[PDB]
Design an enzyme around this catalytic site. Structure first.
Site, mmCIF file in Angstrom:
data_model
loop_
_atom_site.group_PDB
_atom_site.id
_atom_site.type_symbol
_atom_site.label_atom_id
_atom_site.label_comp_id
_atom_site.label_asym_id
_atom_site.label_seq_id
_atom_site.Cartn_x
_atom_site.Cartn_y
_atom_site.Cartn_z
ATOM 1 C CB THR A 74 -1.094 0.126 1.151
ATOM 2 O OG1 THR A 74 -0.709 -0.842 2.140
ATOM 3 C CG2 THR A 74 -2.349 -0.280 0.602
ATOM 4 C CG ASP A 92 7.697 -5.022 -27.687
ATOM 5 O OD1 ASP A 92 8.630 -4.713 -28.300
ATOM 6 O OD2 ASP A 92 7.491 -4.456 -26.314
ATOM 7 C CG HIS A 141 11.240 -2.823 -25.312
ATOM 8 N ND1 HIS A 141 9.929 -3.192 -25.419
ATOM 9 C CD2 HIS A 141 11.080 -1.192 -24.634
ATOM 10 C CE1 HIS A 141 9.085 -2.476 -24.797
ATOM 11 N NE2 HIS A 141 9.639 -1.224 -24.355
ATOM 12 C CG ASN A 174 9.208 7.596 -23.361
ATOM 13 O OD1 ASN A 174 8.876 6.663 -22.486
ATOM 14 N ND2 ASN A 174 10.446 7.777 -23.958
ATOM 15 N N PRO A 204 -11.285 4.167 -25.669
ATOM 16 C CG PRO A 204 -13.457 5.112 -26.414
ATOM 17 C CD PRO A 204 -12.041 4.945 -26.672
ATOM 18 C CB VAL A 235 -7.825 -0.829 -23.861
ATOM 19 C CG1 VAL A 235 -8.230 -1.519 -25.194
ATOM 20 C CG2 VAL A 235 -7.218 0.686 -24.152
ATOM 21 C CG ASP A 246 -9.404 3.718 -16.906
ATOM 22 O OD1 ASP A 246 -9.980 4.884 -16.428
ATOM 23 O OD2 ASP A 246 -9.841 2.925 -17.793
ATOM 24 C CB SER A 263 7.547 0.612 -22.683
ATOM 25 O OG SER A 263 8.526 1.009 -21.564
ATOM 26 C CG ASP A 319 -1.252 5.649 -2.939
ATOM 27 O OD1 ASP A 319 -0.572 4.680 -2.105
ATOM 28 O OD2 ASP A 319 -2.521 5.911 -2.694
#
Length: 279
Positions: free
Chosen positions: A16, A39, A69, A161, A175, A177, A200, A224, A260
């Site tokens: 937390t 990727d 990556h 980025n 919207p 995802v 989100d 990423s 947070d």
């Protein structure tokens, strides 16, 4: 379960509040869900995986991962050591060139391909996909995530980025995802994070230590990297039996650590993701 002195990302989501180096998580550990690494694919011959990794499709000649990556973030999804969902199976698509970039035809292709592939693999608990990618807004590339999302594959997309509002960028903009931003260990939105009302969630994305091609392992910087953390976490939780593919993006958001973060510009969310594990 309690894997210690852990990559701060893993540690942060188990906790937390910051200032802790132990990833606590369930026995299940994300056993039996599928994750779709979209990727530059994976180097599954890396020890970390134990052969839960495989290159399932490659819009290029060489399945074998070149950039790295790609592999890196598969590591954060579900390697043994660096991974969130330590027991998950991992499916490399290769939609990208070994110098990062790649055609929007070929991403949409690969977005459409996982809508297929999920039938052809065994994903009772449910499929996840990661899109550690994007660029300019393109309504197709956005539809190529909401189409994928409507299928019952939880899509987790990076924001970027560029320090803008993520609204300009696809497949983040979409919207339905889960757009993801990036914290640093001190709970500041990283300044490379892309923000906005669209978002989100914020994962760990600043200085993530994960797998790397040629057997090695390393630390890199990006939203990423914040994506798998949420991805591997949604793999982790669809396994624990706590959501569908289409309800995860809220249930991740609903059970997060509210307020947070610092460096949250007005409009943007103030959640950080959390695996909620009553250890």
């Amino acid at each position: 379960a309690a894997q210690t002195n852990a990559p701060w990302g893993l540690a942060r989501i188990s906790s937390t509040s910051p200032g802790t180096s132990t990833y606590y998580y369930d026995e299940s550990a994300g056993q039996g869900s599928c994750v779709y690494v979209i990727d530059t694919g994976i180097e599954a011959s890396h020890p970390e995986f134990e052969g839960r990794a495989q290159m399932v499709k490659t819009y290029y000649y060489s399945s074998r991962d070149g950039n790295g990556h790609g592999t890196h973030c598969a590591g954060t999804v579900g390697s043994r050591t660096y991974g969130v969902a330590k027991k998950t199976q991992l499916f490399g698509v290769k939609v990208l060139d070994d110098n990062g970039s790649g055609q929007y035809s070929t991403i949409i292709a690969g977005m459409d391909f996982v809508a297929s592939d999920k039938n052809n693999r065994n994903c009772p608990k449910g499929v996840v996909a990661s899109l550690s990618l994007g660029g300019g807004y393109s309504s197709s590339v956005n539809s190529a995530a909401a189409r994928l999302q409507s299928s019952g594959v939880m899509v987790a997309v990076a924001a970027g980025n560029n320090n803008a509002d993520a609204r300009n960028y696809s497949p983040a903009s979409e919207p339905s995802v889960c757009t993801v931003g990036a914290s640093d260990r001190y709970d500041r939105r990283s300044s490379f994070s892309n923000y906005g009302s669209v978002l989100d969630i914020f994962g760990p994305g600043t200085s993530i230590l994960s797998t790397w091609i040629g057997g090695s392992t390393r630390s890199i910087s990006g939203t990423s990297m914040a994506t798998p953390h949420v991805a591997g976490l949604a793999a982790y939780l669809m396994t624990l039996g706590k959501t569908t593919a289409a309800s995860a993006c809220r249930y991740i958001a609903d059970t997060a650590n509210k307020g947070d973060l610092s460096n949250i510009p007005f409009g943007t969310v103030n959640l950080l993701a959390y695996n909620n594990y009553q250890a």
